[PDB]
């Protein structure tokens, strides 16, 4: 889906499989967190479905020894003194000692400030202990989390439930047309992008000799040249668009290991899973009611949440019993208007826009004369069309698909291409669609705050700030204090301070809240990027202080208060909203759950050959399953006729379904249901 999803997949630890265990043979004890998983397997990143606990992610600093166990680094404490000597310990080796928490107060020389410190002991015991007892201590605060989990800012303010969803949904982000790095980051986004392998890093230092959208050439110091080719508009495994773009220009000195071009979900070498959106936390006329989302139409007009998707369509021409299927533009009983987008071979041409039902590859298969309906043979006689012994089996566009044809690939047995035995030709057509954000598409943040799009108002309807800039997204307030994910609120505050900038009062010394902040943070320009590492990072005292000294806008006015709220105007009426509302910038991701794929409907269609019931799945143009529990609901209502209609004429009545379709197009009434064909099969199986 995105580079992070691929990196996480290569670092997965699966308990299922041969030699492991069966899913039916896995109690609630194999799945829960074990105290030895600290710094080895992440306790957060795990699916919430039937594979919960059975699939984990490797911790960041963890590694595997040649024996098979997982080692994690620790700082060796000599005599109550922290040393820079680092040694990797296994699970039982860690139990034979006691380790101090990463955030321990430490002297500049290495001695612990408090005699008693929070220390982890064997069998999952946490307690204070003398400073002369600490044998090792953790390397980093984020030592216990996964790469994706380490990407959640203010993770320490989010409960484990929504944190699990926050990391699991980052892997579901869709690569957008243009990518924006988040204002509020954690620092992991850089190494997560580079180590993923979907960017282009320079192997050796040198200068850029020639740069194009197609390739980048690097002139090394020794004299050799290496040229890196860009992957442009490639279809990923899940239909997303893997597209690399050069960053450097002509004649730029670039060091070894530096990102010279970044791909999907990347901005200047950092993971860009979403966009920075101006958010307001308020209920708005019920359109954002319980987890629905209201969006500004600016995100549609400016392609902020527009994504490219590519589908692969395939068809082959085989040898049949009565001849051979041939791919030809000549298709029986088709006008020259439908075949207008095809070349002379029967293939759609590059660049053509194809809706659903359009022909992509014209293939005809010869059908025998003894396979003809009596009406079809009479219909063939009353039209005088002889020599039409072939029927239409062309590759058409499925329901719900539409886009531009970007690529064609043809494989022919005639042209030395090795096809499976019995195949004469193979054609693959790649269709690309440009999907803007739509009502019902699923958005989400990094703190497990998910929701679909319930309404996209015009830009003037949006509640706008004092200077006229309308907000981009409205999030319901009710769905915030239940989930225990305050991190989204703290991100909104820090996000605004990043957008506007700040300046701490330097006169009369450094204030008492900014005493712990680095000197690089006392001043910030607008649109600055910051890092809040997991379990470290910004504290609420420093965050409260930054809101008090936010930079003014171009007119010199401060729009948000020290509380973090701002005065908004109702774009529909004009009256300002009675109370200030929390306003800031939040990083929102577009998840791969779009209504363009999830919508489906069927009048009639294919039926399973054995049971004579409608097919399943959208791809097979199947129907919905009126299950066992749904029949109890009809019976509870007493809706006898609706229930009988569902289970007979609408499903597996072979003669009833056809006579119902005729009765509708005739305007007649609905006939009487017959006997289900599935019940006939049951009897023939009991026999």
């Amino acid at each position: 889906n995105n580079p992070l999803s691929g990196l996480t997949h290569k670092r997965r630890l699966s308990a299922l499989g041969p030699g492991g265990l069966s899913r039916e043979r896995a109690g609630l004890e194999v799945r829960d967190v074990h105290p030895s998983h600290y710094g080895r397997m992440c306790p957060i990143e795990t699916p919430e479905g039937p594979n919960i606990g059975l699939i984990g992610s490797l911790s960041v600093y963890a590694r595997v020894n040649p024996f098979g166990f997982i080692e994690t680094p620790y700082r060796k404490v000599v005599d109550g003194v922290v040393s820079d000597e680092i040694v990797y310990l296994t699970a039982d080796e860690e139990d034979r000692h006691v380790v101090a928490q990463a955030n321990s107060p430490i002297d500049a020389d290495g001695r612990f400030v408090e005699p008693r410190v929070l220390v982890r002991r064997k069998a999952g015991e946490v307690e204070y202990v003398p400073s002369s007892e600490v044998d090792y201590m953790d390397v980093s605060p984020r030592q216990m989390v996964s790469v994706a989990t380490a990407m959640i800012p203010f993770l320490e303010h989010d409960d484990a439930n929504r944190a699990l969803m926050g990391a699991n949904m980052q892997r579901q982000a869709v690569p957008l047309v243009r990518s924006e790095a988040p204002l509020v980051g954690t620092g992991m986004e850089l190494r997560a992008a580079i180590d993923a392998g979907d960017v282009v890093v320079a192997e050796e230092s040198g200068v850029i000799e020639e740069v194009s959208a197609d390739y980048i050439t690097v002139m090394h110091d020794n004299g050799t040249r290496r040229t890196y080719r860009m992957r442009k508009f490639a279809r990923s495994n899940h239909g997303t668009c893997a597209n690399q773009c050069p960053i450097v220009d002509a004649g730029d000195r670039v060091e070894a290991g530096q990102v010279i071009a970044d791909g999907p979900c990347t901005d200047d070498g950092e993971m860009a899973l979403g966009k920075n959106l101006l958010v307001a936390i308020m209920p708005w006329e019920g359109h954002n009611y319980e987890d629905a989302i209201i969006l500004s139409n600016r995100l549609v007009e400016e392609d902020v949440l527009t994504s490219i998707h590519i589908e692969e369509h395939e068809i082959d021409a085989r040898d049949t019993k009565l001849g051979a299927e041939e791919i030809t533009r000549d298709i029986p009983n088709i006008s020259d208007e439908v075949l207008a987008d095809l070349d002379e071979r029967g293939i759609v041409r590059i660049g053509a826009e194809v809706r659903d039902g359009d022909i992509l590859v014209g293939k005809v298969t010869p059908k025998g004369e003894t396979e003809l309906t009596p009406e079809e043979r009479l219909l063939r006689a009353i039209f005088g069309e002889k020599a039409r012994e072939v029927r239409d089996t062309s590759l058409k566009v499925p329901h719900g698909e539409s886009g531009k044809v970007i690529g064609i690939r043809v494989f022919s047995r005639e042209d030395e291409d090795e096809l499976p035995a019995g195949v004469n030709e193979l054609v693959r057509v790649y269709v690309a669609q440009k999907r803007k954000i739509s009502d019902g598409d699923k958005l989400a943040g990094r703190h497990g705050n998910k929701g679909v799009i319930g309404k996209i108002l015009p830009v003037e309807d949006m509640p706008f700030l004092a200077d006229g800039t309308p907000v981009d997204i409205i999030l319901n307030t009710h769905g915030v204090p239940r989930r225990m994910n305050i991190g989204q609120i703290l991100e909104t505050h820090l996000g605004w301070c990043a957008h506007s900038g700040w300046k701490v009062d330097a006169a009369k010394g450094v204030p008492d809240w900014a005493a712990r902040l680095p000197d690089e943070l006392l001043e910030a320009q607008p649109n600055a990027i910051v890092s809040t590492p997991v379990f470290d990072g910004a504290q609420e005292a420093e965050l409260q202080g930054l809101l008090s000294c936010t930079l003014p806008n171009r007119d010199g006015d401060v729009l948000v208060d020290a509380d973090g709220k701002a005065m908004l105007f109702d774009g529909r009426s004009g009256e300002p909203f009675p109370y200030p509302v929390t306003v800031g910038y939040m990083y929102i991701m577009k998840l791969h759950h779009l209504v363009d794929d999830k919508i489906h409907a069927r009048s009639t269609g294919p039926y399973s050959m054995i049971t004579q019931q409608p097919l399943g799945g959208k791809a097979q143009f199947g129907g919905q399953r009126f299950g066992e529990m749904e029949c109890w609901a009809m019976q509870a209502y007493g809706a006898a006729y609706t229930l009988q209609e569902l289970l007979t004429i609408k499903s597996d009545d072979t003669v009833g379904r056809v006579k119902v379709y005729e009765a509708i197009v005739k305007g007649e009434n609905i006939p009487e249901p017959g006997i289900p064909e599935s019940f006939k099969v049951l009897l023939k199986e009991l026999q």
């Binding site: 960041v60 600093y61 680094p73 700082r75 820079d84 680092i86 990463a102 955030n103 390397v139 980093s140 605060p141 790095a181 980051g185 620092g187 850089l190 190494r191 580079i194 890093v201 670039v254 060091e255 290991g257 530096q258 990102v259 200047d268 070498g269 950092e270 712990r516 902040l517 680095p518 690089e520 943070l521 910030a524 600055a528 990027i529 910051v530 890092s531 809040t532 590492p533 470290d536 990072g537 910004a538 504290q539 420093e542």
Partner: peptide, 23 residues
Amino acid sequence: SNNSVPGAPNRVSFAKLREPLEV
């Protein structure tokens, strides 16, 4: 600053603890 090793954009960190071992 955060991650000043490959030549990345200068992301400023609210870090109070030093990183002894890099990822």
